[PDB]
């Protein structure tokens, strides 16, 4: 039998998505499988400039396309993750 009742509480942590945040409209997410081959953080931008087509005597000297290079900025997310394998062996078991 029992004598003393026992009511406690174990809240669930709110799942927050980066790509579903208001922070995500500052970002442009692109995910890879691996990053080994394309490693060098050069990123070119082939930037077009619109031509002002007035009759000022001169046009733009080209249909000018400027390739501006940029350097990447890496950052690792390294987080520890502990799971008790002494109870994960019961996921291994699942016996009857």
């Amino acid at each position: 039998s029992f004598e003393a009742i026992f009511g406690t509480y174990c809240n669930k942590i709110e799942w927050v998505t980066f790509l579903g945040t208001a922070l995500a409209t500052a970002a442009h997410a692109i995910m890879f499988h691996d990053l080994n081959k394309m490693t060098t953080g050069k990123m070119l931008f082939y930037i077009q400039v619109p031509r002002v087509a007035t009759g000022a005597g001169i046009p733009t000297s080209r249909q000018t396309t400027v390739m501006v290079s940029k350097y990447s900025e890496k950052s690792p997310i390294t987080i520890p993750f502990e799971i008790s394998a002494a109870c994960l062996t019961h996921l291994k078991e699942t016996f009857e």
Binding site: T25, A26, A27, H28, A29, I30, M31, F32, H33, D34, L35, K74, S75, P76, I77, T78, I79, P80, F81, E82, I83, A85
Partner: protein, 49 residues
């Protein structure tokens, strides 16, 4: 004598941080799991570059 006496005070400041739409593009690595040799607290270092 006069004196000018100087005061380094320090401010816990909350800041605004505005961006454009596609200001910085991120490329996210696959969430690579890092497993070491089995010690009792079998930690995984789960990481992405």
């Amino acid at each position: 004598f006069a004196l000018t006496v100087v005061r380094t005070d320090t401010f816990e400041t909350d800041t605004l941080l505005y961006s454009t739409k596609a200001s910085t593009a991120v490329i996210i690595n696959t969430p690579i799991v890092t497993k070491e040799d089995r010690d009792i607290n079998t930690v995984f270092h789960v990481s992405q570059n």
